[PDB]
Amino acid sequence: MERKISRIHLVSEPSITHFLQVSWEKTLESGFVITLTDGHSAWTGTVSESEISQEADDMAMEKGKYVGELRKALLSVYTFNFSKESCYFFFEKNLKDVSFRLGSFNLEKVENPAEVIRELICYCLDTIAENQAKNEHLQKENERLLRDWNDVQGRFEKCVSAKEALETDLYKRFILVLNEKKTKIRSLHNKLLNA
Amino acid sequence: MERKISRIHLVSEPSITHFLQVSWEKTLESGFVITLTDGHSAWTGTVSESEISQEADDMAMEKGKYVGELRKALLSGAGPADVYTFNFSKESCYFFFEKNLKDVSFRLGSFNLEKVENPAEVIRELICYCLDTIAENQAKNEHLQKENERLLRDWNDVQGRFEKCVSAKEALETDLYKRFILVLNEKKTKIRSLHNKLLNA
Amino acid sequence: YGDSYFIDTDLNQLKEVFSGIKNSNEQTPEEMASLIADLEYRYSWDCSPLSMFRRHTVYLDSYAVINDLSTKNEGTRLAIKALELRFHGAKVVSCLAEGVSHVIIGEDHSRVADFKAFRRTFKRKFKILKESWVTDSIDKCELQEENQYLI
């Protein structure tokens, strides 16, 4: 899969931070490729398992946490220390009662140091496609929704008010003619009483 | 803010090619700082009003928006579609882009860059502009899509309520008519009976 | 009016008479809503699923703030909750009042605590009813139950 830049900050050199552009192939122990750069020189390392996979099989492979350890080890956390000269990336794992080592990433270097940088510029392009323009897309979406909601809420106000006014006027006329009927029946009852 | 890296492949070195990440200074007629980086190395510079005037006049242009041309050249507010040959000869440490105006590749820029002390600093600048990228043209979808979900649910709610309210208003008209007329006719029937027994009284 | 003296029930006659009778708003929509509900109780018309909250005003948390007019949640369904209340005659108030027994929270239902505090302030306590209590006020075209949600 495509070499995606996972920027990492070395504890040895946090100033010029590194970029573990790791193209992990479906695993981190049976085939993966890591292209590490500090943003200046690209150690594009088509690495194999002949340099790290033995780290598994030589140092007490117990039964607690290994996949997550190596996964967080490729992001910005342990004492990430990539050796510029030897093209080798290492770091120390810290935990209870013992501090093991985890990664022996011997990340080879290609002659082109701008490969990861030009890939990071394609990355500035799509990352640039990460907030406002498709904001504008889903925003014409929510704006047609907003106009629909505004029009339907206006007509909701209108229909509720029209229902209220209709009930009010019907009840007004009913009250008037009912007072007519009640006065008539009361007067007729009084005439009944007189007779 | 939009420190748009004009991805340009140098006609001198397309492999180690330069990437025009500038930080333009406001009031371009007064000057600006040209910063240019090829990733492997970098070359920042300064442009004076003499260079600005000479490049404005190169395209046979008088009294206008050449400052806008430089704005669109430095940080490329418009994409690479703006045809400026952002060819920096890192061998000559001289940056120059040309605007093809009046059928001639007239010199739109001739910027005397200088070798950076350490490319790492401008690389950090490039990767923080990269975070601004990461928030620039297709993820606030989530934001106005939170809004989109809110508007969808509320609009459907209001549509249902409005339909039920117009139906309820018509039902209220007819049922109020029925109820009120029932009351009046019951009063009238009571009046009929009262008058009839008044005749008997 | 056009109404006669000795005629029994029908439907068209009241249409004609009410056309004959005046068309004036003698009373305000809220006061005449209360009178409409009064006559609805008097003639058992309050069973109508069309308007039964016409007596009591009902507070709404139609806003990001409680008992204040400082905001208005646009792009939401809160003024919609207000219209849903008003459709049955539940008069909507932006500020909690002691004449309120039903209260509907905004889109987010985290404003329950301040509602309880104002219940401590407002002696006639109001039950803390979620938005659905008033969405279904028209969605089913029928009043919902105060016991449906927090008291």
Side-chain angles (χ1 to χ4, degrees), chain A residues 31-53:
Chain A
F32 70 90
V33 162
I34 291 190
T35 74
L36 183 41
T37 198
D38 48 356
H40 181 257
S41 62
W43 305 270
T44 289
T46 47
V47 295
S48 55
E49 299 307 323
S50 85
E51 76 195 18
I52 185 166
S53 64

mmCIF file of all heavy atoms in Angstrom, chain A residues 31-53:
data_model
loop_
_atom_site.group_PDB
_atom_site.id
_atom_site.type_symbol
_atom_site.label_atom_id
_atom_site.label_comp_id
_atom_site.label_asym_id
_atom_site.label_seq_id
_atom_site.Cartn_x
_atom_site.Cartn_y
_atom_site.Cartn_z
ATOM 1 N N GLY A 31 6.624 -8.771 6.619
ATOM 2 C CA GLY A 31 6.689 -7.998 5.395
ATOM 3 C C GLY A 31 6.135 -6.594 5.524
ATOM 4 O O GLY A 31 4.918 -6.403 5.595
ATOM 5 N N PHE A 32 7.022 -5.602 5.558
ATOM 6 C CA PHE A 32 6.623 -4.202 5.569
ATOM 7 C C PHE A 32 7.789 -3.362 5.068
ATOM 8 O O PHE A 32 8.944 -3.792 5.092
ATOM 9 C CB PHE A 32 6.164 -3.743 6.963
ATOM 10 C CG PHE A 32 7.272 -3.646 7.975
ATOM 11 C CD1 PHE A 32 7.978 -2.466 8.145
ATOM 12 C CD2 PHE A 32 7.601 -4.733 8.765
ATOM 13 C CE1 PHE A 32 8.997 -2.379 9.074
ATOM 14 C CE2 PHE A 32 8.615 -4.648 9.696
ATOM 15 C CZ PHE A 32 9.313 -3.470 9.852
ATOM 16 N N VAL A 33 7.467 -2.157 4.602
ATOM 17 C CA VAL A 33 8.445 -1.224 4.051
ATOM 18 C C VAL A 33 8.249 0.117 4.740
ATOM 19 O O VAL A 33 7.123 0.624 4.807
ATOM 20 C CB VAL A 33 8.314 -1.081 2.525
ATOM 21 C CG1 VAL A 33 9.006 0.185 2.041
ATOM 22 C CG2 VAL A 33 8.902 -2.302 1.838
ATOM 23 N N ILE A 34 9.333 0.680 5.267
ATOM 24 C CA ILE A 34 9.277 1.948 5.981
ATOM 25 C C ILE A 34 10.200 2.938 5.291
ATOM 26 O O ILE A 34 11.410 2.700 5.186
ATOM 27 C CB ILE A 34 9.673 1.799 7.452
ATOM 28 C CG1 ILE A 34 8.621 1.004 8.205
ATOM 29 C CG2 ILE A 34 9.832 3.163 8.079
ATOM 30 C CD1 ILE A 34 8.814 1.027 9.676
ATOM 31 N N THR A 35 9.640 4.055 4.853
ATOM 32 C CA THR A 35 10.414 5.149 4.286
ATOM 33 C C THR A 35 10.427 6.284 5.304
ATOM 34 O O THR A 35 9.440 7.011 5.444
ATOM 35 C CB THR A 35 9.816 5.602 2.955
ATOM 36 O OG1 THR A 35 8.621 6.350 3.194
ATOM 37 C CG2 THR A 35 9.469 4.394 2.098
ATOM 38 N N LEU A 36 11.540 6.435 6.013
ATOM 39 C CA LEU A 36 11.678 7.452 7.045
ATOM 40 C C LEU A 36 12.397 8.667 6.484
ATOM 41 O O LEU A 36 13.376 8.537 5.745
ATOM 42 C CB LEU A 36 12.442 6.916 8.260
ATOM 43 C CG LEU A 36 12.606 7.860 9.460
ATOM 44 C CD1 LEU A 36 11.344 8.649 9.745
ATOM 45 C CD2 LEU A 36 13.037 7.110 10.706
ATOM 46 N N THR A 37 11.900 9.849 6.828
ATOM 47 C CA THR A 37 12.589 11.087 6.512
ATOM 48 C C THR A 37 12.444 12.036 7.690
ATOM 49 O O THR A 37 11.515 11.920 8.491
ATOM 50 C CB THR A 37 12.045 11.746 5.237
ATOM 51 O OG1 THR A 37 13.002 12.691 4.746
ATOM 52 C CG2 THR A 37 10.750 12.480 5.530
ATOM 53 N N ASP A 38 13.393 12.959 7.799
ATOM 54 C CA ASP A 38 13.297 14.076 8.726
ATOM 55 C C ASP A 38 12.711 15.311 8.062
ATOM 56 O O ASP A 38 12.717 16.391 8.662
ATOM 57 C CB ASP A 38 14.675 14.394 9.310
ATOM 58 C CG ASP A 38 15.748 14.487 8.244
ATOM 59 O OD1 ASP A 38 15.437 14.220 7.065
ATOM 60 O OD2 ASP A 38 16.904 14.818 8.584
ATOM 61 N N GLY A 39 12.204 15.172 6.838
ATOM 62 C CA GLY A 39 11.772 16.291 6.037
ATOM 63 C C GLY A 39 12.847 16.872 5.147
ATOM 64 O O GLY A 39 12.525 17.650 4.242
ATOM 65 N N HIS A 40 14.108 16.503 5.365
ATOM 66 C CA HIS A 40 15.239 16.997 4.592
ATOM 67 C C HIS A 40 15.849 15.930 3.698
ATOM 68 O O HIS A 40 15.969 16.129 2.485
ATOM 69 C CB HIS A 40 16.311 17.553 5.543
ATOM 70 C CG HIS A 40 17.515 18.101 4.843
ATOM 71 N ND1 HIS A 40 18.706 17.413 4.762
ATOM 72 C CD2 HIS A 40 17.713 19.276 4.201
ATOM 73 C CE1 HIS A 40 19.585 18.139 4.094
ATOM 74 N NE2 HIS A 40 19.008 19.273 3.742
ATOM 75 N N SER A 41 16.240 14.795 4.271
ATOM 76 C CA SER A 41 16.798 13.677 3.524
ATOM 77 C C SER A 41 15.900 12.464 3.716
ATOM 78 O O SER A 41 15.491 12.161 4.841
ATOM 79 C CB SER A 41 18.228 13.371 3.978
ATOM 80 O OG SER A 41 18.260 12.999 5.343
ATOM 81 N N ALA A 42 15.592 11.779 2.618
ATOM 82 C CA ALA A 42 14.609 10.702 2.621
ATOM 83 C C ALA A 42 15.319 9.357 2.723
ATOM 84 O O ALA A 42 15.975 8.918 1.773
ATOM 85 C CB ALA A 42 13.747 10.762 1.364
ATOM 86 N N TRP A 43 15.187 8.702 3.877
ATOM 87 C CA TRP A 43 15.619 7.313 4.027
ATOM 88 C C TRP A 43 14.448 6.417 3.641
ATOM 89 O O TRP A 43 13.766 5.821 4.479
ATOM 90 C CB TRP A 43 16.094 7.032 5.447
ATOM 91 C CG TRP A 43 17.164 7.951 5.933
ATOM 92 C CD1 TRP A 43 18.510 7.775 5.813
ATOM 93 C CD2 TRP A 43 16.983 9.185 6.636
ATOM 94 N NE1 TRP A 43 19.179 8.826 6.389
ATOM 95 C CE2 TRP A 43 18.264 9.705 6.903
ATOM 96 C CE3 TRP A 43 15.862 9.900 7.068
ATOM 97 C CZ2 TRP A 43 18.456 10.907 7.580
ATOM 98 C CZ3 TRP A 43 16.053 11.093 7.737
ATOM 99 C CH2 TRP A 43 17.339 11.584 7.986
ATOM 100 N N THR A 44 14.210 6.327 2.336
ATOM 101 C CA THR A 44 13.185 5.431 1.804
ATOM 102 C C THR A 44 13.703 4.003 1.913
ATOM 103 O O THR A 44 14.471 3.535 1.070
ATOM 104 C CB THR A 44 12.843 5.808 0.366
ATOM 105 O OG1 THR A 44 12.123 7.046 0.354
ATOM 106 C CG2 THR A 44 12.000 4.728 -0.303
ATOM 107 N N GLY A 45 13.307 3.316 2.980
ATOM 108 C CA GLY A 45 13.816 1.989 3.253
ATOM 109 C C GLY A 45 12.884 0.863 2.864
ATOM 110 O O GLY A 45 11.914 0.575 3.571
ATOM 111 N N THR A 46 13.174 0.206 1.741
ATOM 112 C CA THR A 46 12.456 -1.007 1.352
ATOM 113 C C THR A 46 12.924 -2.146 2.258
ATOM 114 O O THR A 46 13.645 -3.063 1.859
ATOM 115 C CB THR A 46 12.685 -1.320 -0.120
ATOM 116 O OG1 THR A 46 14.081 -1.208 -0.421
ATOM 117 C CG2 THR A 46 11.905 -0.349 -0.995
ATOM 118 N N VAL A 47 12.494 -2.065 3.511
ATOM 119 C CA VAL A 47 13.021 -2.923 4.563
ATOM 120 C C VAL A 47 12.386 -4.302 4.475
ATOM 121 O O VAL A 47 11.320 -4.488 3.879
ATOM 122 C CB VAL A 47 12.790 -2.278 5.944
ATOM 123 C CG1 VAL A 47 13.582 -0.990 6.052
ATOM 124 C CG2 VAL A 47 11.314 -2.015 6.173
ATOM 125 N N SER A 48 13.060 -5.283 5.062
ATOM 126 C CA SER A 48 12.598 -6.661 5.097
ATOM 127 C C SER A 48 12.467 -7.123 6.546
ATOM 128 O O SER A 48 12.636 -6.349 7.492
ATOM 129 C CB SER A 48 13.550 -7.566 4.313
ATOM 130 O OG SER A 48 14.878 -7.440 4.788
ATOM 131 N N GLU A 49 12.160 -8.407 6.710
ATOM 132 C CA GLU A 49 12.042 -9.006 8.030
ATOM 133 C C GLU A 49 13.355 -9.576 8.546
ATOM 134 O O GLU A 49 13.407 -10.027 9.695
ATOM 135 C CB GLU A 49 10.977 -10.105 8.019
ATOM 136 C CG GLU A 49 9.595 -9.607 7.647
ATOM 137 C CD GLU A 49 9.151 -8.426 8.491
ATOM 138 O OE1 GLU A 49 9.460 -8.398 9.702
ATOM 139 O OE2 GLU A 49 8.492 -7.522 7.941
ATOM 140 N N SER A 50 14.411 -9.560 7.738
ATOM 141 C CA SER A 50 15.714 -10.049 8.164
ATOM 142 C C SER A 50 16.411 -9.105 9.135
ATOM 143 O O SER A 50 17.539 -9.391 9.551
ATOM 144 C CB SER A 50 16.608 -10.291 6.945
ATOM 145 O OG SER A 50 17.267 -9.099 6.555
ATOM 146 N N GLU A 51 15.770 -7.998 9.505
ATOM 147 C CA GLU A 51 16.371 -7.023 10.406
ATOM 148 C C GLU A 51 15.537 -6.713 11.639
ATOM 149 O O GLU A 51 16.109 -6.266 12.641
ATOM 150 C CB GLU A 51 16.651 -5.709 9.662
ATOM 151 C CG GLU A 51 15.413 -4.870 9.402
ATOM 152 C CD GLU A 51 15.648 -3.788 8.373
ATOM 153 O OE1 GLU A 51 16.642 -3.883 7.624
ATOM 154 O OE2 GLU A 51 14.847 -2.833 8.328
ATOM 155 N N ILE A 52 14.219 -6.925 11.611
ATOM 156 C CA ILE A 52 13.358 -6.644 12.748
ATOM 157 C C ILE A 52 12.634 -7.889 13.248
ATOM 158 O O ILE A 52 12.473 -8.068 14.460
ATOM 159 C CB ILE A 52 12.349 -5.519 12.437
ATOM 160 C CG1 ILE A 52 11.560 -5.176 13.701
ATOM 161 C CG2 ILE A 52 11.436 -5.903 11.285
ATOM 162 C CD1 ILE A 52 10.806 -3.899 13.623
ATOM 163 N N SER A 53 12.173 -8.756 12.342
ATOM 164 C CA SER A 53 11.350 -9.889 12.758
ATOM 165 C C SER A 53 12.057 -10.782 13.768
ATOM 166 O O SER A 53 11.386 -11.468 14.546
ATOM 167 C CB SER A 53 10.929 -10.717 11.543
ATOM 168 O OG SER A 53 12.052 -11.304 10.910
#
